[PDB]
Amino acid sequence: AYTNFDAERDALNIETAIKTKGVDEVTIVNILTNRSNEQRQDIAFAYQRRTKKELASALKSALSGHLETVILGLLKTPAQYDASELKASMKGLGTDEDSLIEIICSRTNQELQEINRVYKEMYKTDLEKDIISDTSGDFRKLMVALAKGRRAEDGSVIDYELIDQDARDLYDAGVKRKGTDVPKWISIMTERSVPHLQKVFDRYKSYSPYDMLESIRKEVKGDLENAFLNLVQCIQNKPLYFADRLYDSMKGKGTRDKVLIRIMVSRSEVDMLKIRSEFKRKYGKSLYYYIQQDTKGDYQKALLYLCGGDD
Ligand SMILES: [Ca+2]
Ligand SMILES: [Ca+2]
Ligand SMILES: [Ca+2]
Ligand SMILES: [Ca+2]
Ligand SMILES: [Ca+2]
């Protein structure tokens, strides 16, 4: 059991590290990446109590580069972190649609409920209004729909008649016809429960010569296509979705650090064991190994601790 004294000792050691000549990043990492998010909140509270300064602010001053990104993201609650990443994806004249998509397509009803609330508290506007302001067309419709966090909950009964009718409707709305009935697609894929849709997408293969992902690639393009492809992966197998995004983030020249960092920070306490298992099964070497090859120094050490172990 983690006590008040534990948080005070951690805060004391972190202050010690920060004020050490040259900054002791190793201690800061060893501690923070090996505490739960709730413990890090306790630690920040104790830190402020002892120094009269905010821990996030002190660490922003003490750290730099990608390490600073990792540690500052770890210091936020899950909902704060997601809300701030959403805010960042909409900042400026452009939109980081990949990041917007990743978060909105993968978060559950309960996660999105908290994100909607916390985003309103942090930025004083509803998440939905910022999404509307940054997006347009069917991509906007889909994002707004998902961000409500009102998907049907997993039922007690498998609705086989509806599984079949939804599969038919997805087919009739897309591959069977000229053009696409995109509102039908949005309705089915946002409203039905996840286990229901897993079965719908399998039944869909009975009607369509192409599976759901290939059908999306044939029917739609741009941000809308990107969004549906991410959504369907999240529904089918979310740990594998994140394993693939991690792989993509490191596979080539350099690193998409913003994605690597966000996934390691946000999934470390959620489903990191399943992500690792899917990753190792598909890629043959561990997530740990890929992080090792792509990153270096204290930053690498922090990501490896968030990974939690080799496979
Ligand atoms: Ca140093
Ligand atoms: Ca800094
Ligand atoms: Ca923008
Ligand atoms: Ca079509
Ligand atoms: Ca690389």
Swiss-Prot record:
Q: What else is known?
A: It may cross-link plasma membrane phospholipids with actin and the cytoskeleton and be involved with exocytosis.
Q: What is known of its domains?
A: A pair of annexin repeats may form one binding site for calcium and phospholipid.
Annexin repeat ranges, renumbered to this chain? 5-76, 77-148, 161-233, 237-308
Q: Which residues carry this modification: N6-acetyllysine?
A: 21, 124, 199
* Species annotation: Homo sapiens
Gene3D superfamilies, alphabetized? Annexin
The record's subcellular location field reads:
Secreted, Extracellular space, Extracellular matrix, Basement membrane; Melanosome
**Top-level taxon of origin:** Eukaryota
What's the PTM story here?
A: ISGylated.
Q: Spell out which residues are annotated as carrying Phosphoserine.
A: 156
Crosslink feature (Glycyl lysine isopeptide (Lys-Gly) (interchain with G-Cter in SUMO1)) location: 21
Chief subcellular site?
secreted
Similarity section: Belongs to the annexin family.
**Cross-link (Glycyl lysine isopeptide (Lys-Gly) (interchain with G-Cter in SUMO2)), chain numbering:** 21
GO biological process: what's one of them?
A: vesicle budding from membrane
Q: Quote the function comment for this protein.
A: Calcium-regulated membrane-binding protein whose affinity for calcium is greatly enhanced by anionic phospholipids. It binds two calcium ions with high affinity. May be involved in heat-stress response. Inhibits PCSK9-enhanced LDLR degradation, probably reduces PCSK9 protein levels via a translational mechanism but also competes with LDLR for binding with PCSK9. Binds to endosomes damaged by phagocytosis of particulate wear debris and participates in endosomal membrane stabilization, thereby limiting NLRP3 inflammasome activation.
Presence of keyword Cell wall biogenesis/degradation:
no
According to the UniProt record, one GO cellular component term is:
cytosol
Molecular function per GO: cadherin binding involved in cell-cell adhesion; calcium ion binding; calcium-dependent phospholipid binding; calcium-dependent protein binding; cytoskeletal protein binding; identical protein binding; phosphatidylinositol-4,5-bisphosphate binding; phosphatidylserine binding
Question: Which key words tag this protein in UniProt?
Answer: Acetylation, Annexin, Basement membrane, Calcium, Calcium/phospholipid-binding, Extracellular matrix, Host-virus interaction, Isopeptide bond, Phosphoprotein, Repeat, RNA-binding, Secreted, Ubl conjugation
Q: How does it assemble?
A: Heterotetramer containing 2 light chains of S100A10/p11 and 2 heavy chains of ANXA2/p36. Interacts with ATP1B1. Interacts with DYSF. Interacts with COCH. Interacts (via repeat Annexin 1) with PCSK9 (via the C-terminal domain); the interaction inhibits the degradation of LDLR. Interacts with CEACAM1 (via the cytoplasmic domain); this interaction is regulated by phosphorylation of CEACAM1. Interacts with APPL2 and APPL1; targets APPL2 to endosomes and acting in parallel to RAB5A. Interacts with S100A4. May interact with UBAP2.
Which protein, by its recorded name, is this? Answer: Annexin A2
Ranked from the top, the taxonomy reads: Eukaryota, Metazoa, Chordata, Craniata, Vertebrata
Associated disease: Increased expression of ANXA2 is associated with hepatocellular carcinoma tumor progression.
Residues with PTM Phosphotyrosine = 171
Quick one: which gene encodes this?
A: ANXA2
User: Which InterPro entries has this protein been placed in?
Assistant: Annexin, Annexin_repeat, Annexin_repeat_CS, Annexin_sf, ANX2
